[PDB]
From a paper:
To further investigate the antibody epitope, we determined the crystal structure of H3v-47 Fab in complex with H3N2 A/Minnesota/11/2010 (Minn2010/H3v) HA, at 3.57 Å resolution. The Fab binds to the globular head of HA below the RBS, in a region near the vestigial esterase subdomain. A total of 23 residues from Minn2010/H3v HA participate in intermolecular contacts, making a total of 18 hydrogen bonds (H bonds)/salt bridges with both heavy and light chains, as well as 96 van der Waals (VDW) interactions. PheH54 from CDR H2 (a signature residue on CDR H2 of VH1-69–encoded germline antibodies), and ProH100a, ProH100d, and TyrH100f from CDR H3, mediate the hydrophobic interactions with the HA. For example, Lys82 in the antigenic site E makes one salt bridge by its side chain (Nζ) with AspH64 (Oε2), and eight VDW interactions with Gln61H and AspH64, mainly from its main chain. The structure of H3v-47 in complex with H3v HA revealed that a region close to previously defined antigenic site E, containing the natural variant E82K, is a key site of vulnerability.
The HA can be divided functionally into three major regions: (1) the receptor-binding subdomain (RBS), (2) the vestigial esterase subdomain located lower down on the HA globular head, and (3) the membrane-proximal stem region that is responsible for the low pH-triggered membrane fusion activity of HA in endosomal compartments. Here, we describe the unique human mAb H3v-47 that mediates very broad neutralization of H3 influenza viruses by binding to an unusual conserved epitope on the side the H3 HA head domain.
Residue numbers in the entry:
A (entry chain A): 8 to 110
B (entry chain A): 276 to 326
C (entry chain B), D (entry chain B), E (entry chain B): 1 to 174
Write the structure that this text describes.
Amino acid sequence: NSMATLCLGHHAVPNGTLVKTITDDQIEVTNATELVQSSSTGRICNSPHQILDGKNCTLIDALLGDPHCDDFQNKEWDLFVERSTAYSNCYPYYVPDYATLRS
Amino acid sequence: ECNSECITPNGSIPNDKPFQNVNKITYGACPRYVKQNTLKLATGMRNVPEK
Amino acid sequence: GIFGAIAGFIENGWEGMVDGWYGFRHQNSEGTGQAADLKSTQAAINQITGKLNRVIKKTNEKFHQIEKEFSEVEGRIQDLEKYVEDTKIDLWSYNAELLVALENQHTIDLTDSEMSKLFERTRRQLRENAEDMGNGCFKIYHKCDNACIGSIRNGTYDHDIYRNEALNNRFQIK
Amino acid sequence: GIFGAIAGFIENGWEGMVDGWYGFRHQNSEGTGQAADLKSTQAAINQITGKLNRVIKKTNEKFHQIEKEFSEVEGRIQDLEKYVEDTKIDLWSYNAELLVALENQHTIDLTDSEMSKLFERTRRQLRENAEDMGNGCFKIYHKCDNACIGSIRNGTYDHDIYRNEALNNRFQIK
Amino acid sequence: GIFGAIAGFIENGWEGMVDGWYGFRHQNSEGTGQAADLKSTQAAINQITGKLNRVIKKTNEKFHQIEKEFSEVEGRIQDLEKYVEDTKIDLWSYNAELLVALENQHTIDLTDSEMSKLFERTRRQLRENAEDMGNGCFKIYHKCDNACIGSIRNGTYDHDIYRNEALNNRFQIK
Ligand SMILES: *[C@@H]1O[C@H](CO)[C@@H](O[C@@H]2O[C@H](CO)[C@@H](O[C@@H]3O[C@H](CO[C@H]4O[C@H](CO)[C@@H](O)[C@H](O)[C@@H]4O)[C@@H](O)[C@H](O[C@H]4O[C@H](CO)[C@@H](O)[C@H](O)[C@@H]4O)[C@@H]3O)[C@H](O)[C@H]2NC(C)=O)[C@H](O)[C@H]1NC(C)=O
Ligand SMILES: *[C@@H]1O[C@H](CO)[C@@H](O[C@@H]2O[C@H](CO)[C@@H](O[C@@H]3O[C@H](CO[C@H]4O[C@H](CO)[C@@H](O)[C@H](O)[C@@H]4O)[C@@H](O)[C@H](O[C@H]4O[C@H](CO)[C@@H](O)[C@H](O)[C@@H]4O)[C@@H]3O)[C@H](O)[C@H]2NC(C)=O)[C@H](O)[C@H]1NC(C)=O
Ligand SMILES: *[C@@H]1O[C@H](CO)[C@@H](O[C@@H]2O[C@H](CO)[C@@H](O)[C@H](O)[C@H]2NC(C)=O)[C@H](O)[C@H]1NC(C)=O
Ligand SMILES: *[C@@H]1O[C@H](CO)[C@@H](O[C@@H]2O[C@H](CO)[C@@H](O)[C@H](O)[C@H]2NC(C)=O)[C@H](O)[C@H]1NC(C)=O
Ligand SMILES: *[C@@H]1O[C@H](CO)[C@@H](O[C@@H]2O[C@H](CO)[C@@H](O)[C@H](O)[C@H]2NC(C)=O)[C@H](O)[C@H]1NC(C)=O
Ligand SMILES: *[C@@H]1O[C@H](CO)[C@@H](O)[C@H](O)[C@H]1NC(C)=O
């Protein structure tokens, strides 16, 4: 027949991912990547930042020297962790400007 | 015991993404807290299946 | 489609082309075949990898900030602490939302650019020896065996040695 | 014009075309006429409606925020409350300003895309039977009555049955 | 390159063309020459000057804001003052970073638009009297002296008076 034919094109995928653009709320592309970390383990990794578990002590009880917080004397942290289970067991006190001091 | 640069009240999270929806309260090398639960960034072309 | 090629004049994408993003599909006297174009494939990938790398980079460690949950009612100072944080979050959410939108539209459009860029490169390559059929395919007006097709792809196609035949085939009556 | 069609190679827009955005205007042995192309018209409209819908969506109810006007001098705590709000407003004004700019530039450019997309669709449709006159019009080298024109628009134009005539008309001397 | 012209099908930019941005370079029986195209040159410049002016405009005087460096530890009120300012700076840095990115990509792309716009303007101008060689040059199929070239640039080129010669030169055998 003294002829031939040549087609040009692009690929596709059986499945696809819907993404948002300027003009479209949903539009399908061959793939995409998720930019929002939406999930967690539920557990705090003890490295690399130095974690100090406050356990049954609050930071202020640990500061003042509440007897059940003797284990916290002269300790350091990158992050001090206060637990809801914490309590106080010493003389009744009031820290005006509590939040500032804790901070 | 594990290793993670970003800490929230909900546990540590991966900071390989740019945004996060775990908690507005964070510590360390964390993703930006946003309100969205998902943001798909297209890495391919317009997918036009055959049939 | 902005450049009007993907979902514009090309009807479908090739689900069976899994060795590249853009490519060639042909038919001649020696049968049919298909092979990817690694230039335009890699070009699209490079642009996308570039912006992907550029979006996905880390920020500064943030250390001791303000309280964002409050156990007691404090009024004015708390109102402000809440207001500041909320303001922040809305703005960052906005930026993210917009970023993705702009980026995605651009990705859609740059890949459409690469499609037409490939098509035009070929159209020029073939000079007067073939015609645009409208659907992203060319009609070749001369015998073009598998070796010939392999000179078009790979850009080693001298049109001048086929020119004579092609012109005679193009300009007849019916 | 980015795609170079509207205010680029097309001289004017058609103030008398009020049945569409893009369309055809012609002259032949049976007189002159005009009719809109609903495909490209609707395409531009869909894109714009999409982004319009996407811009114009509501936000969260906002309830008890901070005071933003003050009747007395309070110094440091007021200074901050004012500073926070002002900061916020500048950033939101910026976002708005930029949003409109980007969107508008894109709207200008996507409608220019649709113009060239239509033109190229037709240029391919007509194969070798007509020539690009430069101003957004084609010179048809064969008799093409109103019925013929109505096969070009509506994409039912088989070029092959006119090809013979057109080639003879295209390749003469003067 | 998005429009695929600069660093796409044009191999190099002309370091010796210092009288414009876009232009023409030619060879004929009377030798070689070069001259700039002031239309497309000025068009690119106008767009860029416009956005440049638009980016570079001043803001409001800002007067008595908050303290941003502190000589003493104050805790909660200072924590907030620091937090507000830091938040602000991150957001403004972001906006700036993004602005430049978008603008630069657009500038790259609009100048590529102007290149192809010029090329297409010429391709249409020349009708059937010349062929696209692929590298941003045209092959003229008729004698075209310096005066002739000076009618192509300057858009006073009537193709019809050369058409006859050109067709005969285009459609021979070898
Ligand atoms: C469709 O969309 C998907 C979504 O994932 C894309 O998938 C991604 O593809 C890229 C490219 O291959 C993957 O990137 C790879 O990540 C590996 C994991 O390394 C991580 O390790 C630690 C984990 O703590 C991090 O700190 C670190 O920064 C990395 O995040 C890397 O190992 C890879 O690099 C090297 O790995 C091999 C290992 O032998 C080396 O030999 C190579 O030289 C290579 O350079 C690589 O960077 C990415 O992980 C994929 N996503 C996911 C979720 O896994 C698709 O690419 C896209 N398209 C297709 C067709 O799927
Ligand atoms: C942080 O604070 C929490 C809460 O106060 C402490 O948890 C309690 O710790 C005490 C002291 O170690 C535990 O007391 C032990 O209780 C066992 C069960 O008895 C009662 O336990 C709970 C709490 O009262 C009741 O709800 C339950 O119904 C039982 O009636 C006893 O078996 C233990 O007896 C012996 O324990 C050891 C020897 O093994 C010695 O101390 C004595 O010989 C003692 O006789 C003891 O009485 C209590 O059980 C803990 N609570 C719970 C729910 O288990 C944490 O210890 C404290 N510190 C941290 C977490 O580091
Ligand atoms: C196309 O050009 C490339 C130049 O790299 C050639 O690629 C070779 O292809 C043959 C198969 O035909 C392989 O055996 C070689 O290993 C390839 N070489 C490289 C460096 O990739 C190819 O030969 C050219 N096309 C034709 C039809 O010969
Ligand atoms: C173009 O294609 C459309 C297919 O829908 C045809 O549209 C019809 O146009 C005629 C007028 O010529 C109307 O009477 C019909 O009601 C239209 N039908 C529909 C479904 O819209 C049209 O006939 C085609 N063009 C020509 C020249 O026949
Ligand atoms: C191109 O058109 C312009 C119209 O302005 C002409 O420009 C003149 O060029 C000549 C040199 O050939 C100068 O002497 C004149 O001063 C120019 N006039 C202006 C107003 O710029 C030019 O003549 C046209 N091209 C040719 C080949 O004649
Ligand atoms: C399947 O779709 C997912 C998105 O849900 C995508 O990440 C993946 O690349 C797709 N894989 C295939 C083989 O289509």
